[PDB]
Subunit: 300 residues, 2 copies
């Protein structure tokens, strides 16, 4: 079969991307029904971003200060509000290309597709993970702010992420579509720090199962181990602690491959303690943590 | 900014994917204007695939033997022909969602986006490279045959690849949209072999430039070298030989980073001769050859 990092098809979301301008500042928005969602920092200059009072900046703006452009065609703004760190611009027109959608706050370790945009135009799509420290490792130039992350199930799009900023360290922070940040981040240009980025253990195990399925299994060993003792090793290598929840989520992959979860944990232990020794697994010389168990099943 | 493997937005191509059935056999097709393009092996059983005479199999089939389904809606087949290894089914209806398009035969080392499908339904999109031996390393289950590869420029889609088969070794072969195979492959279930898979040198250099731009440059050395002497080292590590064409293509990246192409070739030489020594470049522990110079510019 083979094994690739794979985004959801982006066409349903392409139809919702718009440009929003307010002063010089232009960025991407999401047009769903008769509402445009965008980062509230569209109302800031570069000067304001050091110490913005978002109340007082927004109080200067009326409905006509916002220029929403959908391809060639401008929308009329008949209502604005701020919910947390998102701006909700009410427009005259319902989007004809609105898919079935929900807004979801995802958990760290979950994956999603990102459509990266510039002036309301999609340019690229990729699959990523929400890191344990609530950052993402993305591609976001200037003009990409308000680029969005999603999952697709049936023909329901679940919107989980809006891009707001690059932190001084070059990693990325953003909100849900209710405008709450993931992590402790704020929409201001100060020195903000993420915690230690750990590896998502359950995703690693999932990927090892994907490897076995595809015929890569040099890493399978004789040993087994315990949950308890696995976690001591996990602590030392900055792996997330594995729980019984995690074990249960791997059960289908366990069933398909004939390998018990603790036997796979023992394989991993030895890769942590000895390294990969120059060899590769599914064409990679590192342990990949950016596929959930669900993603491996979907693909397999 | 950051740096990801990034597919083109797939929405323009989603609108062209259909199911084609002929006997039991079902696979994906591409509906452009009033023509459906699909792999000619849709007319084969599993038995036929050992030694198919495609003339004689097709001669048994009339127009009504082909069941083209577009979502819920069936098309009427008013003409069939075989061009090389593709079947061209003429239909009654022009596709309303036909984008501006061309068919292009790409060269080895060029990249494209793939939309992987099942029964005329897109499920996933990823970026890949045509390898020097004309194979691709893909994700293709049963039912994915006639999944398509493309590039997008402006709003022109350039269709360059149709998936036909998995070779015994688990790599993938397919055609252009004129039905000529890339490589020496045939659409039959025999033991077929690809040549030695070499690394695409110019793509590696492009990626090193991407690394420099993003602030990863531990690998930059004091040395320089010659084209001639670089290639001797390239030969030993199964890298493609670098030409003056290649040097010229890197000139914009050279201009932006302030590093001459031969100085970068010298960096690479030392990574080949010494390895990466456990360190990473743009989060990778191997040298990536799946971004062209154009891709790095597009993204940067």
């Amino acid at each position: 079969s083979g094994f690739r990092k794979m985004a959801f098809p982006s066409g349903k979301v392409e139809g919702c991307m718009v440009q929003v301008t307010c002063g010089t500042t232009t960025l991407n928005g999401l047009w769903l029904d008769d509402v445009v969602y965008c980062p509230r920092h569209v109302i800031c200059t570069s000067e304001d971003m050091l110490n913005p009072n978002y109340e007082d900046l927004l109080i200067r703006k009326s409905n006509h200060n916002f220029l929403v452009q959908a391809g060639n065609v401008q929308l009329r703004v008949i209502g604005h509000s701020m919910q947390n760190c998102v701006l909700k611009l009410k427009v005259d027109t319902a989007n004809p290309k609105t898919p079935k959608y929900k807004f979801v706050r995802i958990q760290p370790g979950q994956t999603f597709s990102v459509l990266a945009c510039y002036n309301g135009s999609p340019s690229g799509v990729y699959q990523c993970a929400m890191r344990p420290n609530f950052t993402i490792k993305g591609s976001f130039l200037n003009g990409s702010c308000g680029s969005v992350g999603f999952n697709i199930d049936y023909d329901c799009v679940s919107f989980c992420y809006m891009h707001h900023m690059e932190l001084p360290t070059g990693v990325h922070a953003g909100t849900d579509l209710e405008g709450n940040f993931y992590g402790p981040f704020v929409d201001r240009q100060t020195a903000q720090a993420a915690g230690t980025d750990t590896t998502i253990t359950v995703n690693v195990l999932a990927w090892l199962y994907a490897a076995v399925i595809n015929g890569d299994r040099w890493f399978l060993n004789r040993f087994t181990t315990t949950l308890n003792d696995f976690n001591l090793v996990a602590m030392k290598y900055n792996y997330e602690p594995l729980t019984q929840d995690h074990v249960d989520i791997l059960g289908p992959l366990s069933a398909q491959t004939g390998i018990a979860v603790l036997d796979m944990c023992a394989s991993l232990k030895e890769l942590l303690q000895n390294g990969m020794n120059g060899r590769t697994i599914l064409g990679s010389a590192l342990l990949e943590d950016e596929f959930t168990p669900f993603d491996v099943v979907r693909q397999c």
